[PDB]
Paper text:
General control non-repressible 5 (GCN5)-related N-acetyltransferases (GNATs) are a large superfamily of enzymes, playing prominent roles across a large number of biological processes including aminoglycoside antibiotic resistance, transcription regulation, protein acetylation and stress reaction. The transfer of an acetyl group from acetyl-CoA (AcCoA) to substrates such as aminoglycoside antibiotics alter the fundamental characteristics of these molecules and can render them inactive. Functional GNAT proteins generally contain six (or sometimes seven) β-strands and four α-helices arranged in a (β0)-β1-α1-α2-β2-β3-β4-α3-β5-α4-β6 topology. Here, we describe the structure of a GNAT family member from E. anophelis.
The protein was structured as an α/β protein and comprised of six α-helices and nine β-strands with a topology of β1-α1-α2-β2-β3-β4-α3-α4-β5-α5-β6-α6-β7-β8-β9. The structure exhibits two β-sheets comprised of β-strands 1-4, and β-strands 5, 6, and 9, splayed to create a V-shape. Our structure contained a well-ordered acetyl-CoA molecule bound in the active site. The interface between acetyl-CoA buries 593 Å2 of surface area and mediated by 10 hydrogen bonds. Key residues involved in these hydrogen bond interactions include Ile68, Val70, Asn76, Gly78, Gly80, Gly81, Gln110, Tyr112, and Lys116, and specific interactions are summarized in Table 2. Based on the position of the acetyl-CoA in the structure and well characterized kinetic studies of GNAT enzymes, the most likely active residues are Ser107 and Try114. Approximately 62% of GNATs have been reported to contain a conserved Tyr as a general acid to initiate the catalysis, and the positioning of Tyr114 from our structural analysis is consistent with this. GNATs adopt a wide variety of assemblies, ranging from monomers, dimers, trimers, tetramers, hexamers, and dodecameric (double ring) structures. Analysis of the interfaces present in the crystal using PISA45 suggests the protein is most likely to be a dimer. In this assembly configuration, the two monomers bury a surface area of 1464 Å, and mediated by ten hydrogen bonds and eight salt bridges.
Residue numbers in the entry:
A (entry chain A), B (entry chain A): 2 to 154
The structure:
């Protein structure tokens, strides 16, 4: 909606694993990019309803390692508001490219990221097969490969 | 449906440009891969309602350069029947890989081809921008790049 607020996560505050796990089934992988990344929390009427994690590769590129919206609040435009906020945060830290990777089966998400300016740029063959023990499925398609999209900032 | 027939196009028969143009807006590009490709026609109660073109790259790979279903008959499973038939024809000619390329904005099609066994393998940046004069748009996304998918036969 139009009355959502976004702030960085504060030390001592609970980490919204419920939300992060909607986007990444591995709590181990989440905690790893929380080490060097920056977590942001989207609040609406005092409740944390969404989040994203920015994860620098280097000076030029930073990656959205995780972006999630509470299941009760999806498909109301909150994700788009989050993506706009990520774009500003990455620009403010002088990154030149913003990257996000999603599953080959995530065809709905491939629309959304392109709507906000991401171009499809790379395929990571068997990324999910190699990095997650149990296979992952969407829409009856096995999610084996990562599709990487890139936005020039 | 279950009562569709598929046959190669016969010399002297009209070429269904109405159908081919649904899949490729350039009659010039269509006629070019009709030169070295093979056109197949799907008939239902005597009417041509779909078609595809197979276009060899070399001994190992052949490409679906064009696949189309009449607008009145779409989303009834005819395209899937066509894709199954292409797979058999390519195997029968001893190809090892079957390739199809669609637009970055064609997220519905990215589902369908993966459902029938195609993996996303390659991005052709600015393919449509370079090869078609007028820009092409889908779902409010500009169609600039070709997504190439590959099936091991
Ligand atoms: C790096 C990573 O984290 S990849 C994993 C991403 N996270 C997840 O998958 C976790 C689970 N899902 C979610 O948390 C969320 O659904 C998100 C983060 C993916 C998206 O957030 P949302 O608030 O649901 O998205 P939002 O409402 O802004 O837009 C979704 C869009 O999909 C569109 N859409 C609807 N049906 C379809 C469809 N069949 N195909 C494509 N797009 C569709 C909607 O219309 C909407 O677009 P629009 O606003 O232009 O009309
Ligand atoms: C190389 C080239 O030619 S690329 C260009 C391809 N051709 C074209 O775009 C021409 C215009 N379109 C067409 O001719 C046809 O629609 C084709 C050839 C793309 C597909 O043929 P169709 O008969 O419509 O497909 P079919 O009915 O078998 O299946 C379409 C699928 O999309 C699914 N679908 C529906 N909504 C969506 C959505 N939002 N996102 C993804 N998939 C969706 C349908 O459920 C169906 O899948 P299912 O059978 O597994 O449930």
């Amino acid at each position: 909606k139009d009355n959502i607020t976004i702030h960085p996560h504060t030390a001592g505050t609970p980490i919204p694993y419920d939300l992060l796990l909607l986007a990444d089934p591995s709590k181990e992988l989440i905690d790893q990019y929380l080490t060097s990344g920056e977590l942001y929390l989207a609040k609406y009427n005092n409740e944390i309803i969404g989040c994203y994690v920015l994860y620098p590769w280097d000076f030029e590129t930073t990656e959205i390692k995780n972006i999630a919206v509470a299941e009760k609040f999806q498909n109301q435009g909150i994700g788009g508001q989050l993506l706009k906020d990520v774009i500003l945060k990455a620009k403010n830290k002088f990154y030149k490219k913003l990257v996000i990777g999603t599953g080959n089966s995530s065809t709905g998400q491939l629309y959304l990221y392109q709507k906000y300016g991401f171009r499809i740029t790379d395929i990571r063959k068997n990324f999910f097969k190699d990095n997650y023990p149990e296979p992952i499925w969407e829409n009856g398609i096995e999610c084996t490969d990562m599709i990487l999209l890139t936005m020039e900032l």
